[PDB]
């Protein structure tokens, strides 16, 4: 047997051993042909009229094996001068097999074409098109930059606030940790501010959900755009101060709606609280230590099959794949969740909201049960995202293997999928969903019921996903509180976002602040992160408390911890477990102070969130929004205003006993001493109970009680 897929697995950042590299070579470029033939004596390629012998021998070694890196054959062809038909011939000891015919046509960049870049006016120069005998594959062009211009945008970015001088792209991808290092993101947008020292600033939005690429050098920003059948790039230009630029973008693509004030309280989470007994124990500990918590997220609550039913629930399977009502279920005294309604009622009685984990995947690995009945219904009734050949797409991912994706691009399937969860909101009164994932769709030719293909639709999937569960909540009369890592243009309108997965390190802390700031510049209002990281050994006391203190000043304050295989000791990120692990007796009392102060801030955050939604001036706000013409702000990229009145300066390094903050024009008050402070550079002591925060003097009368 021998396998060759020209596009391969279509990992956006990597290549599989079975594919053509590159998939679309430039004329003059050689091409690498991989093939997987685990058992073969010899493998040759018939390339045009030639014959090319294949040799014996990015993607992790472990991932590569799964795709058959062992037994992978490859050869480099002569440079492509023209379209070439090719196939492969292989045999085991005199038993031969031949693949089908593949064709590859070389492409070239030209300024000659019927294609247009529309909407950029005099800002756009150097328009070119990547063309082959197949058609026009990509557009490319240049936006003129001036001196002192910064590029801030592109969705959620973990490496830098200002992207000028960097190469980056916009495509939805799950990068597991180290997002800043790799320069990747769960939540890209083809949009950015161009904001500069003197002249009136501006911004642009490339209107596509197809992949886009960015690079800047000198005075030009180069923009490359993947195309569909129509060789047209529609480019929106917005003019004004940064807030007015953002308003233009959000007027076009969508905007947050006011969420309930309770989202501004502390969110508690950890993956290993997998039973009623554990969730109630952890929340009881919060209560007994007098650390206020406003929401609990339960990630493993479910049967771990369909992920729409409480673990150990007892019910008659619906063979037809129809949704269950609440009364279908019995809960056994000895089960993982003997009485989930009683648990939730008690949490609600204490003023704590309950959030349940979700994934947009239907496991195919089971032959029987509700999960198998539903998967079969998905295929039968057309609820699954499809391949080009009409079979259902299978998660080409590494976990939840070969799972189907519900096609959330259309209303009937959003209805069908969410209907299975309806009893969770209507009977159990669940307050929200952590809608995790949504990055799973890989291929250019995938087919969505809304008529889009994968090159267009795959980036939109997490938007549809968030929206679907937002709408479920709405339909039950509740606020659309979804909690998502992944998104794209338009995600602004749906729920809450968190920065995704990271280790517990100062580097991740800094990357996370940048993620929040960049997301906010693009209209993502309610944003948070796992404070001091969820992955690996429990954070040390200093990182945890620096993280906790800054996070009390961020839109969403949340802690979380990764699955540890239920080993001991625990990897919980709870304040008390961190105290226990570190042996540091400052951790609980100081975290409590931060959390208690946080509680007092909820009316401020609520008012400021409302202003952000009304004026588009961001909630977690880079200084360039209010001070575009102050050059000094760019030397302090981790500083921000929380709403109009407060300037925050997170302590991002270990060992710091003092910290310096740059206060822009206007009058300021140090919130810890109530003393006036002059604008400009200010240095103060930073013991663990302090993160530098300054209030606009005119409004200090309103904020003083919070800090009293």
XYZ file of C-alpha atoms in Angstrom:
708
model
C 0.000 0.000 0.000
C 1.169 3.517 -0.823
C -0.377 6.860 0.141
C 0.166 10.387 -1.172
C -1.976 13.415 -0.282
C -0.706 16.564 -2.061
C -2.024 18.876 0.691
C -1.264 16.383 3.448
C -2.948 16.771 6.824
C -3.163 20.535 6.220
C -1.687 21.488 9.539
C -1.397 25.241 8.977
C 2.147 25.433 10.356
C 3.531 21.987 9.422
C 3.842 19.319 6.730
C 2.998 15.617 6.845
C 5.236 12.854 5.352
C 2.625 12.017 2.695
C 2.444 15.408 0.987
C 3.836 17.779 -1.613
C 6.124 20.489 -0.203
C 5.288 23.193 -1.032
C 1.776 22.399 -2.160
C 1.939 25.348 -4.570
C 5.548 25.791 -5.755
C 6.700 28.908 -7.572
C 7.868 28.378 -11.141
C 11.568 27.636 -10.830
C 11.251 26.058 -7.394
C 11.952 22.380 -6.831
C 9.285 20.387 -5.030
C 9.614 17.760 -2.335
C 7.358 14.741 -2.722
C 6.640 12.674 0.366
C 4.903 9.301 0.356
C 3.912 6.794 3.029
C 4.544 3.160 2.112
C 5.371 1.286 5.346
C 6.083 -1.986 3.585
C 7.772 -1.594 0.213
C 11.103 -2.693 -1.227
C 11.379 0.198 -3.650
C 9.422 3.341 -4.450
C 9.809 5.470 -7.563
C 7.919 8.463 -8.899
C 6.903 8.863 -12.503
C 7.435 12.570 -12.922
C 6.366 13.928 -16.273
C 8.324 11.735 -18.653
C 11.028 11.071 -16.048
C 11.415 8.566 -13.225
C 12.609 9.669 -9.789
C 13.817 7.177 -7.141
C 12.583 7.870 -3.611
C 14.838 7.721 -0.554
C 14.435 6.236 2.935
C 13.598 9.409 4.858
C 7.688 21.563 12.601
C 6.127 18.189 13.379
C 7.033 16.589 16.682
C 8.662 13.214 16.263
C 5.649 11.682 18.059
C 3.101 13.329 15.738
C 5.182 12.355 12.716
C 5.114 8.634 13.652
C 1.311 8.747 13.836
C 1.270 9.927 10.228
C 3.812 7.242 9.378
C 7.154 9.050 9.402
C 8.722 5.620 9.649
C 8.195 4.008 6.260
C 8.005 7.436 4.648
C 9.642 7.868 1.248
C 10.729 11.140 -0.353
C 12.559 12.710 -3.297
C 13.274 16.244 -4.500
C 12.212 16.901 -8.095
C 13.852 19.131 -10.713
C 12.660 22.784 -10.638
C 9.104 23.254 -11.922
C 9.044 24.796 -15.385
C 5.462 23.845 -16.187
C 2.462 21.762 -15.092
C 3.495 18.187 -14.338
C 1.391 15.044 -14.035
C 2.905 12.497 -11.684
C 2.193 9.238 -9.897
C 4.121 6.763 -7.772
C 5.123 3.149 -8.311
C 5.951 0.798 -5.458
C 6.371 -2.939 -5.014
C 6.970 -5.475 -2.253
C 9.399 -8.142 -3.451
C 7.790 -8.283 -6.880
C 4.227 -7.320 -5.956
C 3.497 -3.884 -7.370
C 1.029 -1.069 -6.727
C 0.491 2.275 -8.435
C -1.096 5.436 -7.063
C -3.552 7.619 -8.938
C -2.518 10.547 -11.116
C -1.614 13.786 -9.359
C -1.003 17.127 -11.047
C 0.852 20.223 -9.924
C 0.968 23.559 -11.753
C 3.694 26.111 -10.875
C 2.646 29.645 -9.933
C 4.065 33.121 -10.439
C 3.712 36.589 -8.968
C 2.591 39.236 -11.452
C 1.148 42.744 -11.441
C -0.882 41.857 -14.545
C -4.420 40.586 -13.880
C -8.185 41.088 -13.892
C -8.062 41.146 -10.098
C -8.598 44.203 -7.927
C -7.733 45.389 -4.476
C -10.679 47.601 -3.586
C -10.954 50.220 -0.883
C -7.453 51.219 0.166
C -7.183 54.358 -1.959
C -3.778 56.020 -2.146
C -2.512 53.998 0.804
C -2.297 50.860 -1.343
C 0.689 50.207 -3.616
C 2.480 47.334 -5.323
C -0.531 45.151 -5.994
C 0.335 41.693 -7.287
C -1.317 38.329 -7.862
C -0.105 34.759 -7.494
C -1.314 32.980 -10.601
C -1.042 29.603 -12.288
C -2.868 27.673 -15.002
C -5.381 26.835 -12.271
C -6.238 30.458 -11.522
C -5.465 33.332 -9.170
C -4.427 31.848 -5.836
C -3.412 34.873 -3.748
C -3.366 38.640 -3.772
C -0.602 40.747 -2.260
C -0.115 44.476 -1.668
C 1.590 47.132 0.415
C 0.195 49.689 2.821
C 2.242 52.850 3.217
C 3.619 53.501 6.702
C 5.147 56.668 8.108
C 7.852 57.182 10.715
C 6.782 56.467 14.270
C 3.832 54.442 13.019
C 3.004 51.417 15.161
C 0.995 48.365 14.140
C -1.348 47.185 16.928
C -3.988 44.606 16.247
C -4.331 41.346 14.398
C -6.523 39.864 17.090
C -4.972 38.375 20.198
C -1.153 38.474 20.050
C 1.257 37.056 22.587
C 4.694 38.317 21.443
C 4.328 42.104 21.152
C 1.869 44.981 21.338
C 3.512 46.652 18.324
C 3.880 44.211 15.411
C 5.971 46.461 13.143
C 9.093 44.726 11.852
C 7.637 41.264 12.308
C 6.321 38.489 10.146
C 2.944 37.101 11.246
C -0.257 35.660 9.837
C -3.931 35.324 10.747
C -5.235 31.789 11.013
C -7.053 30.010 13.823
C -4.718 27.486 15.383
C -4.340 25.683 18.653
C -0.773 26.188 19.746
C -0.340 24.317 23.024
C 1.588 26.757 25.200
C 4.462 29.046 24.155
C 2.125 31.101 21.949
C 4.385 34.152 22.154
C 7.504 32.170 21.261
C 5.902 30.738 18.111
C 4.046 33.930 17.256
C 0.741 32.081 16.880
C -2.774 32.530 18.241
C -6.184 30.994 18.900
C -7.860 34.291 18.073
C -6.430 36.133 15.033
C -8.137 38.950 13.116
C -7.093 40.543 9.783
C -7.333 43.974 11.383
C -4.944 46.441 12.984
C -4.426 50.013 14.108
C -1.849 52.102 12.306
C -1.113 54.633 14.994
C 1.619 57.196 14.898
C 3.429 60.136 16.396
C 1.902 63.116 14.597
C -0.589 62.624 11.783
C -4.155 61.410 12.239
C -4.102 57.652 12.799
C -6.040 54.994 10.929
C -6.745 51.286 10.659
C -7.591 48.561 8.171
C -9.635 45.386 7.955
C -9.048 42.894 5.172
C -12.472 41.487 4.669
C -11.962 37.770 4.436
C -12.020 34.735 6.684
C -9.340 33.160 4.457
C -5.727 33.038 5.654
C -3.726 36.281 5.508
C -0.015 37.012 6.073
C 1.794 40.129 7.255
C 5.306 41.518 7.178
C 6.730 44.969 7.643
C 10.132 46.398 6.814
C 11.061 50.000 6.186
C 8.066 52.185 5.406
C 5.818 49.443 4.031
C 3.425 46.878 5.495
C 3.076 43.950 3.114
C -0.275 42.127 3.163
C -0.802 38.739 1.500
C -4.286 37.293 1.068
C -5.519 33.795 0.195
C -8.273 33.936 -2.429
C -11.305 31.943 -3.455
C -12.738 31.865 -6.981
C -13.023 35.640 -7.152
C -9.756 37.559 -7.580
C -10.928 40.460 -5.406
C -9.589 41.808 -2.123
C -12.006 44.091 -0.295
C -10.128 46.337 2.097
C -11.799 48.605 4.646
C -9.996 51.727 5.809
C -11.000 53.470 9.043
C -9.902 56.989 9.940
C -9.767 58.820 13.267
C -8.336 58.482 16.754
C -7.852 54.835 17.792
C -11.294 54.574 19.425
C -13.016 55.932 16.318
C -11.008 53.512 14.174
C -12.178 50.666 16.408
C -15.772 51.920 16.193
C -15.666 51.645 12.415
C -14.356 48.075 12.638
C -16.911 46.994 15.267
C -19.822 48.733 13.505
C -18.929 46.478 10.605
C -18.064 43.160 12.273
C -19.872 43.250 15.625
C -19.484 44.396 19.198
C -19.848 43.132 22.786
C -23.132 43.373 24.619
C -23.219 44.111 28.334
C -22.789 40.964 30.381
C -24.010 40.662 34.009
C -21.858 42.212 36.695
C -21.117 38.841 38.294
C -18.617 37.958 35.521
C -16.309 40.459 37.202
C -15.963 38.351 40.333
C -13.274 35.711 40.824
C -13.554 32.607 38.644
C -12.339 29.378 40.232
C -11.372 26.344 38.211
C -9.396 23.171 37.998
C -9.559 20.250 35.675
C -9.295 17.580 38.313
C -12.409 18.565 40.210
C -14.296 15.738 38.594
C -16.879 14.793 41.232
C -19.673 16.451 43.207
C -17.665 15.746 46.383
C -14.581 17.532 45.007
C -16.344 20.604 43.607
C -18.239 21.066 46.858
C -15.007 20.524 48.870
C -13.037 23.133 46.907
C -15.855 25.702 47.134
C -16.303 24.957 50.848
C -12.613 25.747 51.262
C -13.084 29.082 49.452
C -15.895 29.847 51.898
C -14.016 28.748 55.009
C -10.925 30.785 54.072
C -13.151 33.776 53.291
C -11.836 34.091 49.719
C -14.811 35.359 47.714
C -15.563 33.514 44.483
C -18.227 34.448 41.934
C -18.084 31.493 39.523
C -16.913 27.891 39.380
C -15.985 26.182 36.139
C -16.369 22.412 36.029
C -14.364 20.892 33.201
C -14.806 17.219 33.801
C -18.446 17.015 34.694
C -19.555 14.718 31.976
C -19.717 11.119 30.785
C -16.613 11.934 28.723
C -18.413 10.538 25.710
C -20.970 12.948 24.379
C -20.009 15.693 26.836
C -23.623 16.658 27.235
C -24.558 14.345 30.123
C -23.434 14.251 33.798
C -20.976 11.415 34.481
C -22.667 8.250 35.820
C -26.130 9.433 34.824
C -28.580 6.614 34.122
C -31.016 6.837 31.210
C -32.527 5.005 28.264
C -30.530 5.772 25.101
C -32.485 7.455 22.319
C -31.669 5.331 19.255
C -32.698 8.174 16.938
C -30.127 10.645 18.263
C -32.787 12.962 19.679
C -31.991 15.149 22.683
C -32.877 14.132 26.284
C -35.204 15.862 28.694
C -34.215 16.250 32.360
C -36.565 13.551 33.592
C -34.815 10.951 31.384
C -31.947 10.917 33.871
C -31.461 9.212 37.223
C -28.452 9.934 39.406
C -27.156 7.166 41.663
C -26.134 7.790 45.298
C -22.757 6.186 44.640
C -22.135 7.970 41.330
C -19.726 10.818 40.607
C -22.641 13.307 40.693
C -25.326 11.897 43.016
C -27.359 15.114 43.090
C -26.134 17.806 40.686
C -29.235 20.014 41.124
C -28.667 20.135 44.894
C -25.012 21.049 44.339
C -25.921 23.856 41.946
C -28.774 25.119 44.120
C -26.379 25.416 47.077
C -23.732 27.201 44.986
C -26.412 29.582 43.700
C -27.545 30.132 47.310
C -23.999 31.287 48.073
C -24.068 33.555 45.010
C -21.716 31.362 42.971
C -22.398 30.735 39.256
C -21.781 27.398 37.570
C -20.035 27.005 34.207
C -19.828 23.681 32.335
C -17.087 22.708 29.845
C -17.918 22.086 26.189
C -16.109 20.964 23.039
C -17.518 21.064 19.482
C -16.712 17.416 18.747
C -18.657 14.172 18.644
C -16.519 11.139 19.502
C -16.601 8.354 16.923
C -14.486 5.825 18.840
C -17.486 4.194 20.515
C -19.638 1.580 18.799
C -22.532 1.863 21.234
C -24.402 4.181 23.578
C -25.871 7.636 23.153
C -22.605 8.944 21.755
C -22.737 6.446 18.850
C -26.430 7.017 18.235
C -25.823 10.781 18.002
C -22.812 10.442 15.682
C -24.888 8.252 13.382
C -27.714 10.791 13.468
C -25.208 13.521 12.605
C -24.199 11.728 9.405
C -27.738 10.610 8.537
C -29.391 14.015 9.008
C -26.549 16.174 7.737
C -25.354 17.751 10.997
C -21.651 17.072 10.381
C -19.037 19.220 8.661
C -18.191 17.451 5.391
C -15.142 16.593 3.302
C -15.121 17.417 -0.407
C -16.144 13.842 -1.210
C -19.249 14.129 0.956
C -18.089 11.918 3.832
C -18.035 13.460 7.323
C -14.897 15.301 8.380
C -12.884 13.555 11.082
C -10.848 15.366 13.667
C -7.401 15.191 12.180
C -6.324 16.290 15.540
C -4.261 14.505 18.094
C -6.831 14.194 20.960
C -10.576 13.295 20.518
C -9.354 11.282 17.470
C -11.536 11.182 14.370
C -14.350 13.014 16.159
C -17.019 14.665 13.972
C -17.608 18.424 14.054
C -21.208 19.607 14.253
C -21.792 22.069 11.476
C -22.604 25.159 13.467
C -22.525 27.356 10.385
C -26.294 26.932 10.007
C -29.232 27.448 12.342
C -30.818 23.967 12.144
C -27.641 22.283 13.360
C -26.894 24.943 15.982
C -30.440 24.107 17.209
C -29.910 20.332 17.078
C -26.508 20.396 18.790
C -27.430 22.825 21.570
C -30.801 21.106 22.142
C -28.885 18.268 23.806
C -27.598 20.780 26.366
C -30.932 22.572 26.894
C -31.898 20.693 30.081
C -28.581 21.799 31.625
C -29.674 25.440 31.422
C -33.454 25.031 31.845
C -33.589 22.330 34.557
C -30.176 22.551 36.238
C -30.007 26.372 35.790
C -26.357 26.340 34.605
C -25.093 29.903 34.107
C -22.653 29.519 31.220
C -20.477 27.255 29.111
C -16.763 27.102 28.731
C -16.729 26.566 25.041
C -13.253 25.189 24.603
C -11.603 24.331 21.282
C -13.161 24.971 17.898
C -9.809 25.042 16.011
C -10.230 21.493 14.758
C -11.165 21.989 11.123
C -8.270 21.375 8.766
C -8.673 21.349 5.057
C -9.125 23.798 2.226
C -11.877 21.813 0.529
C -14.070 21.057 3.577
C -17.759 21.809 2.955
C -20.071 23.709 5.323
C -23.850 23.790 5.052
C -23.804 27.570 4.832
C -22.145 27.137 1.409
C -18.619 28.087 2.460
C -15.635 25.855 1.826
C -12.915 25.149 4.367
C -10.455 27.791 3.205
C -13.135 30.335 4.119
C -15.151 28.512 6.784
C -12.537 27.007 9.087
C -11.539 30.328 10.627
C -15.223 31.187 11.146
C -16.004 27.953 13.011
C -15.154 29.189 16.539
C -17.348 32.266 15.944
C -20.353 30.073 15.043
C -19.494 27.888 18.050
C -19.507 30.686 20.635
C -22.631 32.178 19.056
C -24.448 28.830 19.190
C -24.075 28.492 22.951
C -24.671 32.215 23.446
C -28.018 31.675 21.717
C -28.865 28.615 23.835
C -28.405 30.726 26.968
C -30.463 33.572 25.431
C -33.248 31.147 24.524
C -33.409 30.094 28.177
C -33.685 33.724 29.264
C -30.091 33.961 30.471
C -27.131 36.146 29.484
C -24.910 34.731 26.702
C -21.992 33.896 28.917
C -19.717 31.625 26.911
C -16.058 31.371 27.846
C -13.859 30.684 24.778
C -10.166 30.541 23.811
C -10.711 30.517 20.038
C -12.234 33.044 17.691
C -11.950 35.308 14.674
C -13.427 38.496 13.277
C -16.930 38.801 14.735
C -16.149 36.973 17.998
C -16.464 40.375 19.733
C -20.226 39.840 19.894
C -20.062 36.514 21.711
C -19.203 35.964 25.348
C -15.938 35.944 27.210
C -12.441 34.934 26.111
C -9.383 33.623 27.879
C -5.789 33.472 26.648
C -5.609 29.667 26.496
C -2.940 27.242 27.680
C 0.469 28.177 29.169
C 3.151 27.051 31.619
C 3.681 28.909 34.856
C 6.521 31.278 33.989
C 7.202 34.974 33.937
C 7.470 34.779 30.157
C 3.911 33.426 29.870
C 2.716 36.109 32.322
C 4.138 38.837 30.085
C 2.798 37.175 26.931
C -0.616 36.999 28.572
C -0.748 40.721 29.382
C 0.111 41.411 25.717
C -2.626 39.036 24.598
C -5.210 40.959 26.636
C -4.032 44.350 25.353
C -3.983 43.340 21.700
C -7.351 41.564 21.963
C -8.821 44.689 23.554
C -7.466 46.901 20.757
C -9.559 44.712 18.444
C -12.766 44.927 20.490
C -12.515 41.882 22.730
C -13.916 43.317 25.946
C -14.279 40.519 28.434
C -10.917 38.841 28.546
C -8.891 36.918 31.085
C -6.164 34.283 31.419
C -5.214 31.432 33.713
C -3.429 33.515 36.302
C 0.147 32.295 36.794
C -0.468 29.467 34.272
C -2.315 26.139 34.396
C 0.355 23.719 33.171
C 3.236 21.960 34.892
C 4.332 22.163 38.542
C 2.459 24.537 40.846
C 3.760 28.125 40.482
C 6.050 29.549 43.150
C 4.512 32.043 45.592
C 6.056 35.127 43.996
C 4.825 34.481 40.446
C 1.392 33.445 41.743
C 0.909 36.607 43.818
C 2.322 38.926 41.146
C -0.077 37.287 38.697
C -2.996 37.375 41.131
C -2.468 41.051 41.958
C -2.350 42.192 38.332
C -5.286 39.956 37.418
C -7.508 41.621 40.041
C -7.066 44.625 37.727
C -7.992 42.747 34.497
C -11.446 42.238 32.890
C -11.623 38.592 34.021
C -9.888 37.222 37.098
C -9.606 33.446 36.915
C -7.361 30.618 38.073
C -7.206 27.171 36.491
C -5.164 23.960 36.451
C -4.435 21.289 33.826
C -5.294 17.585 34.021
C -2.573 15.796 36.073
C -3.837 12.169 35.709
C -5.267 12.457 39.183
C -1.880 11.986 40.741
C -0.620 13.259 44.108
C 0.450 15.787 44.986
C -2.250 17.941 43.390
C -1.476 20.499 40.686
C -4.403 22.762 41.741
C -3.892 26.508 41.321
C -6.091 27.279 44.361
C -4.555 29.878 46.713
C -4.378 27.371 49.562
C -2.797 24.590 47.534
C -0.193 27.040 46.287
C 0.409 28.055 49.911
C 0.750 24.406 50.864
C 3.086 23.569 47.996
C 5.325 26.580 48.520
C 5.090 26.652 52.304
C 4.500 30.403 51.957
C 2.121 31.786 54.574
C 1.645 35.042 52.708
C -0.181 33.387 49.796
C -3.667 32.895 51.269
C -3.919 36.247 53.114
C -2.581 38.284 50.213
C -4.703 36.491 47.615
C -7.695 37.092 49.907
C -6.863 40.811 49.945
C -6.715 40.886 46.155
C -9.984 38.962 45.812
C -11.722 41.140 48.403
C -10.530 44.316 46.710
C -11.758 42.779 43.422
C -15.259 42.405 44.916
C -15.279 46.122 45.715
C -14.293 46.910 42.121
C -17.294 45.212 40.545
C -19.452 48.361 40.327
C -16.548 50.267 38.712
C -15.845 47.466 36.216
C -19.542 47.238 35.405
C -19.801 50.956 34.690
C -16.556 50.988 32.704
C -17.604 47.920 30.675
C -20.781 49.731 29.763
C -18.751 52.773 28.625
C -16.428 50.545 26.599
C -19.408 49.032 24.835
C -20.952 52.455 24.241
C -17.836 54.398 23.199
C -15.591 51.520 21.981
C -12.806 52.905 24.192
C -11.314 49.625 25.514
C -11.689 48.202 29.020
C -8.137 46.907 29.234
C -6.694 49.879 27.438
C -3.288 50.471 25.845
C -2.212 54.059 26.448
C -2.214 54.915 22.730
C -6.010 55.204 22.794
C -5.980 58.256 25.017
C -2.454 59.459 24.340
C -1.713 58.765 20.706
C 0.868 61.637 20.434
C 2.948 60.734 23.469
C 6.007 58.857 22.163
C 7.053 57.662 25.611
C 4.093 55.269 25.963
C 5.719 52.736 23.627
C 8.576 52.238 26.067
C 6.053 50.791 28.529
C 3.975 48.279 26.518
C 2.740 46.309 29.559
C 1.007 49.311 31.181
C -2.664 49.967 30.612
C -5.687 51.881 31.782
C -8.447 49.784 33.327
C -11.425 51.784 32.176
C -11.069 55.571 32.113
C -9.819 56.122 35.657
C -7.126 53.609 36.631
C -3.622 52.972 35.318
C -2.178 49.544 36.018
C 1.462 48.441 35.897
C 1.831 44.684 36.531
C 5.029 43.521 38.162
C 6.409 41.207 35.497
C 9.815 40.216 36.900
C 10.987 38.111 39.853
C 13.007 39.794 42.601
C 11.738 43.339 42.054
C 11.577 45.482 45.206
C 10.766 48.649 43.266
C 8.872 49.303 40.061
C 8.726 52.253 37.705
C 5.552 53.452 36.032
C 5.135 56.042 33.301
C 2.185 58.300 33.951
C 0.991 60.228 30.888
C -0.416 63.765 30.944
C -2.965 64.661 33.620
C -3.063 64.449 37.415
C -2.578 61.223 39.335
C -3.034 59.680 42.754
C -1.256 56.623 44.119
C -4.174 54.432 45.198
C -2.297 52.755 48.027
C -1.248 55.931 49.845
C -3.841 58.346 48.505
C -0.949 60.754 47.786
C -0.738 62.942 44.687
C 1.957 61.936 42.246
C 3.405 63.943 39.368
C 3.029 62.750 35.777
C 6.121 61.211 34.219
C 8.212 58.351 35.561
C 7.273 57.263 39.073
C 9.056 54.685 41.180
C 7.526 53.059 44.255
C 8.138 50.020 46.435
C 6.514 46.771 45.380
C 6.133 44.342 48.267
C 3.917 41.391 47.296
C 0.777 43.130 48.566
C 1.209 45.926 46.026
C 0.926 46.286 42.279
C 1.322 49.862 41.110
C -2.044 51.442 40.386
C -2.844 55.101 39.881
C -6.156 56.906 39.726
C -7.067 60.055 37.837
C -7.162 62.718 40.537
C -10.542 64.101 39.542
C -12.253 60.730 40.055
C -10.273 59.617 43.130
C -13.237 60.672 45.266
C -15.189 57.820 43.655
C -12.435 55.175 43.856
C -11.105 55.855 47.344
C -13.518 53.535 49.209
C -12.427 50.629 47.007
C -8.907 51.052 48.306
C -9.683 52.146 51.863
